[PDB]
Each structure stands twice: as structure tokens, then as C-alpha cells.
Amino acid sequence: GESLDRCIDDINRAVDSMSTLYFKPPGIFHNAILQGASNKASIRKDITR
Amino acid sequence: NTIQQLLLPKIRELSDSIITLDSNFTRLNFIHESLADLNESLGSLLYGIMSNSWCVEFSQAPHDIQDDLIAIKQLKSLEDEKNNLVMELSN
Amino acid sequence: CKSTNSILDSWINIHSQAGYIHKLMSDQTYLKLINDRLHNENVNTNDEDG
């Protein structure tokens, strides 16, 4: 019935909102710290950089 | 008729669960943004600290700090021994 | 979350070293010893064993 249509519409809206979510990418300083602590050669490469 | 009715509740709880999951993921996204901001602030502080570290010299940085501290506590204990021994002698 | 954890362990290491060397700087005897060590090196750098 119309309840089925309402449920389908609500699910579609929920999925559409779920797709539109954006998670912030790592910033400028996180990259520096993490790549300078990632690997033994990576620490030297980041110190050089 | 009644059989599509038999189904419809199941899709209804599915809809409820999906809506709850969507809201939970939005809250998790807020938490993720907060974590990113905290990471950026702390990483900036650490980067400044390490840049200054690669730029300054401290002339009395120890090298065997574990040996130094065990030696210090050993000397401390020997000093308590000396103090007990001397105050007994004086007494 | 893993990156945040890594940053926090770096902070933990820094603070642990800070605590150890604060313990070192707490004792006056070691500081006196390194002080007259500096003065001895001023008068004679050779006698490290001293």
C-alpha cells in the first residue's frame, strides 16, 4: 500500500543522503608528521623534503 | 493482499534501520572532521617542535639516560646508608 | 584514527623523555658533578676518567 511507497521513498532519501557524505581528507601537517614517521627510509626522505 | 502485508513490516523495519544507520554515519562524519582538526593542530605543533629541534643544539644531552638514572638512585641509596651510619656513630 | 593514535604515541614518547630528564635535573649531585666536569675540561679536557 501507500506505506510501502512511503518506506521506499524514505529508504531512497536515506541512501541519497548517505552517498552525499564527504569525509575530510588529511591536512597539510598530518602528511608531514605521518610520512616522516612512516618508514625508516621515509623519515630520511621527509627530513630531506 | 495479506501476503504483501506480511512483507510490508519487514521492509518497514529495514527502512527504520537504514534511517538510523544514515544518521549514525552523519554523526560519525562529524566525529571524523573533529579528529581531522585535532590531528592538524597537534601535527602543526609537533612539526614546529621538530623543526626547532633540527635547528638548535643542547650541549648536555645525556646518552645512557637509563644508566644515569640507575646510577643516581644507587648513589641516593648509598647516601641514605652514609647518613644512617654517621648519625648512629654520632648518637 | 590510526594517524591520531600515531601522533599521540609520539607525544607519549616526548613526554616520557621529558619526565626522565626532569628526574635527572631533580638531583643536585649529578648537576654539581657535570658542573665541575665542565670546569675540569676548562682546566684539562684530557682527564675524562676523573
From Swiss-Prot, chain A:
It comes from the Eukaryota. It is found in: Nucleus; Cytoplasm, Cytoskeleton, Spindle; Chromosome, Centromere, Kinetochore; Chromosome. Disulfide bonds: none annotated. Signal peptide: none annotated. Belongs to the DASH complex SPC34 family. Component of the DASH complex that connects microtubules with kinetochores and couples microtubule depolymerisation to chromosome movement; it is involved in retrieving kinetochores to the spindle poles before their re-orientation on the spindle in early mitosis and allows microtubule depolymerization to pull chromosomes apart and resist detachment during anaphase. Component of the DASH complex consisting of ASK1, DAD1, DAD2, DAD3, DAD4, DAM1, DUO1, HSK3, SPC19 and SPC34, with a stoichiometry of one copy of each subunit per complex. Multiple DASH complexes oligomerize to form a ring that encircles spindle microtubules and organizes the rod-like NDC80 complexes of the outer kinetochore. DASH complex oligomerization strengthens microtubule attachments. On cytoplasmic microtubules, DASH complexes appear to form patches instead of rings. This is DASH complex subunit SPC34. It comes from Saccharomyces cerevisiae (strain ATCC 204508 / S288c). The chain holds residues 2 to 50 of 295 of the full protein.
Swiss-Prot record, chain B:
Changing residue 24 to Y: Cold sensitive. Residues 69-91 form a coiled coil. It is found in: Nucleus; Cytoplasm, Cytoskeleton, Spindle; Chromosome, Centromere, Kinetochore. Belongs to the DASH complex DAM1 family. Component of the DASH complex that connects microtubules with kinetochores and couples microtubule depolymerisation to chromosome movement; it is involved in retrieving kinetochores to the spindle poles before their re-orientation on the spindle in early mitosis and allows microtubule depolymerization to pull chromosomes apart and resist detachment during anaphase. Component of the DASH complex consisting of ASK1, DAD1, DAD2, DAD3, DAD4, DAM1, DUO1, HSK3, SPC19 and SPC34, with a stoichiometry of one copy of each subunit per complex. Multiple DASH complexes oligomerize to form a ring that encircles spindle microtubules and organizes the rod-like NDC80 complexes of the outer kinetochore. DASH complex oligomerization strengthens microtubule attachments. Within the complex, DAM1 and DUO1 may form the microtubule connections. On cytoplasmic microtubules, DASH complexes appear to form patches instead of rings. This is DASH complex subunit DAM1. It comes from Saccharomyces cerevisiae (strain ATCC 204508 / S288c) (Baker's yeast). The gene is DAM1. The chain holds residues 57 to 147 of 343 of the full protein.
Curated annotation (Swiss-Prot), chain C:
It is found in: Nucleus; Cytoplasm, Cytoskeleton, Spindle pole; Chromosome, Centromere, Kinetochore. Changing residue 18 to T: In DUO1-2; produces abnormal spindles resulting in growth arrest at 37 degrees Celsius. This is DASH complex subunit DUO1. The gene is DUO1. It comes from the Eukaryota. Present with 996 molecules/cell in log phase SD medium. Belongs to the DASH complex DUO1 family. Component of the DASH complex that connects microtubules with kinetochores and couples microtubule depolymerisation to chromosome movement; it is involved in retrieving kinetochores to the spindle poles before their re-orientation on the spindle in early mitosis and allows microtubule depolymerization to pull chromosomes apart and resist detachment during anaphase. Component of the DASH complex consisting of ASK1, DAD1, DAD2, DAD3, DAD4, DAM1, DUO1, HSK3, SPC19 and SPC34, with a stoichiometry of one copy of each subunit per complex. Multiple DASH complexes oligomerize to form a ring that encircles spindle microtubules and organizes the rod-like NDC80 complexes of the outer kinetochore. DASH complex oligomerization strengthens microtubule attachments. On cytoplasmic microtubules, DASH complexes appear to form patches instead of rings. Within the complex, DAM1 and DUO1 may form the microtubule connections. It comes from Saccharomyces cerevisiae (strain ATCC 204508 / S288c).
